XYZ file of C-alpha atoms in Angstrom:
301
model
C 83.343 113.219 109.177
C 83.552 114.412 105.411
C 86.828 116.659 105.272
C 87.426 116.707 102.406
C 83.746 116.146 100.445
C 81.924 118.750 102.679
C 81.472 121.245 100.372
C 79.650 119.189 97.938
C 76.253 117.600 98.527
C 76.760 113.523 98.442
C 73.894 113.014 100.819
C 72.262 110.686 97.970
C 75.031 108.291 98.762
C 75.486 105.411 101.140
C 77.374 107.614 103.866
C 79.597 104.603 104.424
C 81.047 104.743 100.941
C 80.977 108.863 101.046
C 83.503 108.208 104.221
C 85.540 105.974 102.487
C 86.054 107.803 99.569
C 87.779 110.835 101.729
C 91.227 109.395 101.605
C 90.884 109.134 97.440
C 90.529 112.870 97.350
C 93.130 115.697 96.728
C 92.426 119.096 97.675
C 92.712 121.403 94.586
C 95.450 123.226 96.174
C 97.869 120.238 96.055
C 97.387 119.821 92.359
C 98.478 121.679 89.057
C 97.479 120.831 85.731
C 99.376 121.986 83.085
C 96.600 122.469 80.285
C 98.798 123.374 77.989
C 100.839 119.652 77.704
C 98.518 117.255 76.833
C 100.080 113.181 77.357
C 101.451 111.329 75.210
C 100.456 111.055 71.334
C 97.786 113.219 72.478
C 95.138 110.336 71.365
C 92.891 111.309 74.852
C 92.285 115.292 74.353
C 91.380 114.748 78.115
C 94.398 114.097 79.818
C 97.430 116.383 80.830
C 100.468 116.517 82.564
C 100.059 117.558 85.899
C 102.309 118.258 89.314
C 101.137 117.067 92.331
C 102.250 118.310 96.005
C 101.836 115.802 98.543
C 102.858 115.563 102.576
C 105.932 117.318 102.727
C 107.770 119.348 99.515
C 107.356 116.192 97.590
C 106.561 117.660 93.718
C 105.002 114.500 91.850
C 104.717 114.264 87.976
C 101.277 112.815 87.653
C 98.650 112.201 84.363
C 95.280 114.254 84.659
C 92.223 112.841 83.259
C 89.463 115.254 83.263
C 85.994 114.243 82.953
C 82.595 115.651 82.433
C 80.169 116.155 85.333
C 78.477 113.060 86.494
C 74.905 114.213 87.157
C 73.385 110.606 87.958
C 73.210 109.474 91.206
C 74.336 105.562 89.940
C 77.433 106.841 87.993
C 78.554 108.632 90.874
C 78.237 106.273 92.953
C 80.200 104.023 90.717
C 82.792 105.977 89.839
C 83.578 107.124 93.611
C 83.330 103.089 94.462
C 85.851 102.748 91.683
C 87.918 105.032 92.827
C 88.205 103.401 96.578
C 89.057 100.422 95.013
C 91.620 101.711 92.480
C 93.383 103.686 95.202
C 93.207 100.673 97.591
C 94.701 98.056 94.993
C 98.640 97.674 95.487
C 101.074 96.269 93.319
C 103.610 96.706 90.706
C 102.409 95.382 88.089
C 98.782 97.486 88.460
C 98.634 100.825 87.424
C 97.531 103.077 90.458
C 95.388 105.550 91.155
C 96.839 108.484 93.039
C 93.425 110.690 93.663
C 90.277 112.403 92.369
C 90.593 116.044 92.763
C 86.471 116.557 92.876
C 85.119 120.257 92.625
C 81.444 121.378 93.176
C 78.521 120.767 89.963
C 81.988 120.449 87.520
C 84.496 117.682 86.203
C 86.027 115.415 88.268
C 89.926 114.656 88.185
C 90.978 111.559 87.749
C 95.027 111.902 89.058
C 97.336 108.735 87.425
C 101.208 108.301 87.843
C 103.012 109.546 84.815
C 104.056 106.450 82.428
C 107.155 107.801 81.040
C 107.064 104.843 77.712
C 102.812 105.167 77.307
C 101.282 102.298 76.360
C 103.201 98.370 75.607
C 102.109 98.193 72.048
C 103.367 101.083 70.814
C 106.767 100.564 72.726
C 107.046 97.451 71.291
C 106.487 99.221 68.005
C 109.299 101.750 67.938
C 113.495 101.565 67.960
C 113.954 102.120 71.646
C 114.009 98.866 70.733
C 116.208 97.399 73.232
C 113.879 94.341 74.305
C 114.581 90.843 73.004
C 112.590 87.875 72.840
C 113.321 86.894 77.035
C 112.591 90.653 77.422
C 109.531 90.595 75.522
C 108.470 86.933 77.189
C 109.715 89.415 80.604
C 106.753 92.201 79.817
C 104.366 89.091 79.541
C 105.394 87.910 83.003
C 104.818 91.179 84.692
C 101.262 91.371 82.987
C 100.698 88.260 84.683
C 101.584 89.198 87.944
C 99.317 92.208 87.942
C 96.685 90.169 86.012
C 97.227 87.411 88.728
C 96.877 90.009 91.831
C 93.555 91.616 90.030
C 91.880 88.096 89.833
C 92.722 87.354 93.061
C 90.726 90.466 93.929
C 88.178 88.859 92.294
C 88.441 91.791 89.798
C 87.785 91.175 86.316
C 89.130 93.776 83.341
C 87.397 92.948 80.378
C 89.897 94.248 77.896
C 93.272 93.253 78.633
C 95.108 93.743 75.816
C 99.358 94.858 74.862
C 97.717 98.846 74.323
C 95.783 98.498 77.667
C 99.157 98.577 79.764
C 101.845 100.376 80.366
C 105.677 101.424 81.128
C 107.110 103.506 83.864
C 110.692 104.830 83.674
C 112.254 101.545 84.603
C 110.400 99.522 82.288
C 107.647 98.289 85.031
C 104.809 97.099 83.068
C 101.536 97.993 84.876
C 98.208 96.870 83.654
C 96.166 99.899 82.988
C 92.388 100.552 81.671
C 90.723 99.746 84.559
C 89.114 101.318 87.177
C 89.341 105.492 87.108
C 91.647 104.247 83.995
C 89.728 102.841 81.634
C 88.882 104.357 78.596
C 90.960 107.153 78.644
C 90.057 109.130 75.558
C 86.410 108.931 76.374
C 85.290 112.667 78.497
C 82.371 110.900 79.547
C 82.338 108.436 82.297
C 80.481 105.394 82.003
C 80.064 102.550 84.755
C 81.531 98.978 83.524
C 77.428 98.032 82.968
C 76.061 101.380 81.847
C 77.930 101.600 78.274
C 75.119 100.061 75.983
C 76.242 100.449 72.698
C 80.274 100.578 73.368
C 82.121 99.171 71.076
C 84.198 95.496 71.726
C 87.503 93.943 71.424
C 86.728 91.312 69.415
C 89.863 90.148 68.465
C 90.414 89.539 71.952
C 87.620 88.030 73.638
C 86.962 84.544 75.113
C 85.045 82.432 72.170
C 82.026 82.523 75.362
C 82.033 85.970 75.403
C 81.898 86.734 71.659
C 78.680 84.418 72.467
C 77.231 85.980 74.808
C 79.283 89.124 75.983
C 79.771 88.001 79.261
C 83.772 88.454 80.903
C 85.091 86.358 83.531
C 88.670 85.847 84.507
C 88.946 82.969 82.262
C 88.113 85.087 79.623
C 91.031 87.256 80.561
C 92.981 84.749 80.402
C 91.991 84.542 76.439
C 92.851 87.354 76.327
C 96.277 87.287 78.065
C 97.092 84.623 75.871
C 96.858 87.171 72.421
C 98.485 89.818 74.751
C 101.189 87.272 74.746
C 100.884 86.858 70.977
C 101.069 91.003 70.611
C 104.565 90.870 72.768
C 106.344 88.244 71.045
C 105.126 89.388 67.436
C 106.470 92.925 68.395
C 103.008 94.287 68.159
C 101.385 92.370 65.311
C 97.513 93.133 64.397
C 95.987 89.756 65.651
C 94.093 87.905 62.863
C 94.136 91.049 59.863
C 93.558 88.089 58.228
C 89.744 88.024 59.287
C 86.917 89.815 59.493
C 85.881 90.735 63.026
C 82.565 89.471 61.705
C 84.326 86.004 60.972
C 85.860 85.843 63.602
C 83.716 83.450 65.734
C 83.598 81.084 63.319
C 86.693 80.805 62.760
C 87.864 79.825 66.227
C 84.731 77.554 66.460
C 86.761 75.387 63.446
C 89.591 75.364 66.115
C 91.556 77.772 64.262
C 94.199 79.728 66.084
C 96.754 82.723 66.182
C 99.901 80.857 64.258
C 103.279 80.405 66.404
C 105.372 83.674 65.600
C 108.826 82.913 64.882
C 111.570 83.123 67.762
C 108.643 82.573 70.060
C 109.974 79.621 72.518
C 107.489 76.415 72.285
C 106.306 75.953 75.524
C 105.406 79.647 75.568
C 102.939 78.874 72.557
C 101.918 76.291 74.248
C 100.659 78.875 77.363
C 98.808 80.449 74.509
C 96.988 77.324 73.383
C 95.714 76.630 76.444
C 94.902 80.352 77.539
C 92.869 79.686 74.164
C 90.966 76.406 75.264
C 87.561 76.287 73.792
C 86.576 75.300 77.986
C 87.056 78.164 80.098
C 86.810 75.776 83.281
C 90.395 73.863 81.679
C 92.358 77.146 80.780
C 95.175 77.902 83.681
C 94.287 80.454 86.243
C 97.114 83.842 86.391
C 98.215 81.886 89.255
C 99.991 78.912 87.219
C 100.558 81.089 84.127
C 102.921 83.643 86.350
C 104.083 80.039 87.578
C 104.586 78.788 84.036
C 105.969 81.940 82.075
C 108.474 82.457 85.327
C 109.624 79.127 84.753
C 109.963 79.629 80.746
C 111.816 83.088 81.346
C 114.489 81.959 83.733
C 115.460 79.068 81.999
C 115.745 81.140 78.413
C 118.357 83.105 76.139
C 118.148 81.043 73.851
């Protein structure tokens, strides 16, 4: 009935999420973390390389996320609900979650795959710089997809953005900071509502929510739209022109990020509408994977 949480007291659960959180967790004995090789540009001090054993031999090269105990009831219960619906998600173009490896009163273990290029901005950014402009429009379309399956989860992200996802060995995009995944250099965990204080992306949010910090999928899809921008500018700084202050009022004028060069017109033209002041009129990830698709099969240009 609770194989694999029955050494830790969870009783101030709902027992029918404690149940359903038993095929999220690894036993400690499958898992090794490797301390010693921390991920990456080492920009989360909390996350290592790690080898995970599954079924049969099967050696797996995984990212370890530690985090610091979760004493409140709420939290736990949100990240554990988080976790089933990480693990459960399935596609591509999503980043998944492998497991939690959870120990008695200590830090929980998130387990990720390994993302062999980190994170799309930075890729972007250096010469393994092999994409071109229908490569870079390519990334976009993947986002999309995984943006596209999310929604249709009815799961909203909140801070999409070219940094927030990233690239496998074969150069599968997968949206990432979400779930057991989002903000990865923070120790503490903090539920999606229980962050007072936590600082926002700005430069990337709906003109709604800069109003009144509320996210929906339409204002992801503002926010896919300067994801786009990121790609096809090789990883500009969106608007270093203005102050994050400024910022609202400058989009209130109508103002918008400027058409960077090479960047095909009908693919701006996604952008301007992922940018329409009307949430309700902007397309849904359904017709932009449509749209983009279209655009990237038809281009060399």
């Amino acid at each position: 009935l609770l194989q694999n949480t029955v050494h830790i007291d969870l009783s101030a659960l709902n027992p029918e999420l404690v149940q359903a959180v038993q095929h999220v967790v690894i036993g400690p004995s499958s898992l090794i973390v490797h301390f010693n090789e921390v991920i990456g540009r080492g920009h989360f001090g909390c996350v290592y390389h790690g080898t995970l054993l599954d079924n049969d031999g099967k050696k797996i090269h995984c990212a370890v996320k530690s985090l610091n105990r979760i004493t409140d009831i709420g939290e736990v219960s949100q990240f554990l609900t988080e976790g089933i619906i990480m693990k459960d998600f399935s596609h591509p173009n999503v980043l998944s979650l492998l497991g939690i490896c959870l120990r008695s009163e200590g830090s929980p273990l998130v387990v990720l795959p390994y993302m062999k290029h980190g994170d799309l901005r930075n890729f972007i950014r250096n010469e393994t710089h092999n994409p071109t402009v229908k490569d870079l429009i390519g990334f976009g379309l993947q986002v999309a997809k995984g943006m596209k399956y999310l929604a249709s989860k009815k799961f909203v992200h909140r801070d999409l953005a070219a940094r927030n996802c990233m690239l496998d060995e074969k150069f599968t995009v997968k949206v990432a900071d979400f779930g057991l995944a989002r903000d990865m250099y923070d120790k503490e965990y903090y539920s999606v509502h229980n962050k007072t204080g936590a600082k926002l992306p700005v430069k990337w949010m709906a003109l709604e929510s800069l109003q009144t910090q509320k996210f929906t999928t339409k204002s992801d899809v503002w926010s896919f739209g300067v994801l786009l921008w990121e790609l096809m500018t090789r990883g500009a700084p969106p608007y270093p022109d203005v102050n994050t202050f400024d910022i609202t009022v400058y989009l209130l004028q109508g103002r918008r990020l400027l058409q960077p060069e090479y960047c095909p017109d009908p693919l701006y033209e996604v952008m301007l509408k992922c940018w329409h002041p009307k949430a309700e009129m902007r397309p849904s990830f359904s017709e932009l994977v449509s749209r983009i698709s279209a655009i990237f099969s038809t281009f060399i240009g």
